[PDB]
Scaffold this active site. Sequence first.
Site, mmCIF file in Angstrom:
data_model
loop_
_atom_site.group_PDB
_atom_site.id
_atom_site.type_symbol
_atom_site.label_atom_id
_atom_site.label_comp_id
_atom_site.label_asym_id
_atom_site.label_seq_id
_atom_site.Cartn_x
_atom_site.Cartn_y
_atom_site.Cartn_z
ATOM 1 N N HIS A 137 -139.352 53.427 -20.647
ATOM 2 C CA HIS A 137 -140.600 53.675 -20.722
ATOM 3 C C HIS A 137 -141.670 53.138 -21.709
ATOM 4 O O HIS A 137 -142.562 52.541 -21.491
ATOM 5 C CB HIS A 137 -140.679 55.324 -20.550
ATOM 6 N N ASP A 176 -149.144 65.266 -16.240
ATOM 7 C CA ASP A 176 -150.323 65.337 -17.204
ATOM 8 C C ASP A 176 -151.262 64.270 -16.901
ATOM 9 O O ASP A 176 -151.304 63.415 -16.149
ATOM 10 C CB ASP A 176 -149.830 64.800 -18.672
ATOM 11 N N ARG A 177 -152.600 64.741 -17.224
ATOM 12 C CA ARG A 177 -153.925 63.993 -17.152
ATOM 13 C C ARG A 177 -154.336 64.014 -15.749
ATOM 14 O O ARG A 177 -155.694 64.463 -15.388
ATOM 15 C CB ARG A 177 -153.859 62.519 -17.476
ATOM 16 N N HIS A 193 -146.049 53.094 -20.130
ATOM 17 C CA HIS A 193 -146.311 53.630 -21.437
ATOM 18 C C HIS A 193 -147.979 53.241 -21.894
ATOM 19 O O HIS A 193 -148.579 54.152 -22.305
ATOM 20 C CB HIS A 193 -145.602 53.148 -22.622
ATOM 21 N N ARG A 223 -149.740 55.925 -32.804
ATOM 22 C CA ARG A 223 -149.611 57.119 -31.997
ATOM 23 C C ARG A 223 -149.063 58.129 -32.894
ATOM 24 O O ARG A 223 -149.250 59.279 -32.493
ATOM 25 C CB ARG A 223 -148.823 57.051 -30.552
ATOM 26 N N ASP A 227 -143.629 59.152 -16.838
ATOM 27 C CA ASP A 227 -145.211 59.677 -16.980
ATOM 28 C C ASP A 227 -145.635 60.063 -15.670
ATOM 29 O O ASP A 227 -146.555 59.420 -15.348
ATOM 30 C CB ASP A 227 -145.868 58.849 -17.828
ATOM 31 N N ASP A 272 -146.842 54.200 -15.004
ATOM 32 C CA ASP A 272 -147.333 55.696 -15.160
ATOM 33 C C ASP A 272 -148.027 56.059 -13.948
ATOM 34 O O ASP A 272 -149.032 55.328 -13.418
ATOM 35 C CB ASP A 272 -148.165 55.714 -16.257
ATOM 36 N N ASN A 298 -142.474 59.556 -21.926
ATOM 37 C CA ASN A 298 -142.795 60.761 -22.916
ATOM 38 C C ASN A 298 -143.571 61.932 -22.637
ATOM 39 O O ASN A 298 -143.380 62.873 -23.347
ATOM 40 C CB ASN A 298 -143.687 59.789 -24.106
ATOM 41 N N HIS A 299 -144.168 61.865 -21.378
ATOM 42 C CA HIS A 299 -144.659 63.120 -20.861
ATOM 43 C C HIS A 299 -143.759 63.999 -20.171
ATOM 44 O O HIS A 299 -144.279 65.177 -19.880
ATOM 45 C CB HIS A 299 -145.987 62.725 -20.126
ATOM 46 N N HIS A 347 -149.315 59.762 -13.775
ATOM 47 C CA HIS A 347 -149.801 60.951 -14.230
ATOM 48 C C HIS A 347 -150.679 61.819 -13.408
ATOM 49 O O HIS A 347 -151.970 61.869 -13.647
ATOM 50 C CB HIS A 347 -150.699 60.386 -15.391
HETATM 51 MN MN LIG Z 1 -146.208 56.996 -22.120
HETATM 52 MN MN LIG Z 2 -148.667 57.567 -20.022
#
Ligand SMILES: [Mn+2]
Ligand SMILES: [Mn+2]
Lengths: 7, 294
Positions: free
Chosen positions: B167, B89-90, B242, B215, B86, B58, B118-119, B60
């Site tokens: 991922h 995001d963030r 992840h 989750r 990923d 990740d 997943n992002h 991000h």
């Molecule tokens: Mn993830």
């Molecule tokens: Mn992540």
Amino acid sequence: XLXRXXX
Amino acid sequence: LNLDSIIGRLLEVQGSRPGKNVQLTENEIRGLCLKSREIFLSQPILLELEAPLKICGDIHGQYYDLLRLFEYGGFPPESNYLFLGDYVDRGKQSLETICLLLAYKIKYPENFFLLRGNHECASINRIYGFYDECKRRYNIKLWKTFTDCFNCLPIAAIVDEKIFCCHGGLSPDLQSMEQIRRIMRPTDVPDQGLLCDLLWSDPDKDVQGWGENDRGVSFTFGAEVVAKFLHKHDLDLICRAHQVVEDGYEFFAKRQLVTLFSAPNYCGEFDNAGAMMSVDETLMCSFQILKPAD
Ligand SMILES: [Mn+2]
Ligand SMILES: [Mn+2]
């Protein structure tokens, strides 16, 4: 701890 | 598409000051999306790769950390790379992050690889930042362009027939690799199923077999599940990301699985390191780590 969708 | 100009500008801020933006034109970004999308659809959804190569977890939007990773592992094409997803995001700079990665994919399509996380999914983007970043710095249409590109990202990769990379993790529906290969693109990530699991599942020390994931989606799996998977598919390792791990990397099931998280100082509960794994020609593993801000 950020929010579990995820720290 | 002036790829080299885009890359130069993206790299231009290296060392300038953590946080400085690189504002590409929307046409340039649109070009990165359309050309990379084309390449993604052109290559297998289940990538067959060769070592040595570097694998990253990740990111991000932590652009300046991505730059530190490339500085450490060697900026393309000095080394082959496989990112596990990923990218957005963030973080504060998801745009620069995803743009540089797409640029390198287009530039070195046979030596640079990006998997879907997943992002890299529209609904999650709306909640975790990417949508707002695009709306603020560009427009919503560009965000849609990004999602169309994301919908074509490969889902998994196998390095020299021994290392299975994805991922999230394993799926109770994963019986054959051909199932993955059958997944058609463009596609959004479903709420359930193989594709969902590959991008969402997590290994669990405390789980026996498959379990529920906190989750709110997908599953958790135990060491026995891993051991069985590797055996059945004649694999040696499962490499995924992840989850935030304090050391940047963490082994599971007697080193049969490894988790990579490349965004340092991401977690609120702890100061995590960011790790990048070097896999040599004999599939031996070593790490290059971005230790937490001391
Ligand atoms: Mn993830
Ligand atoms: Mn992540």
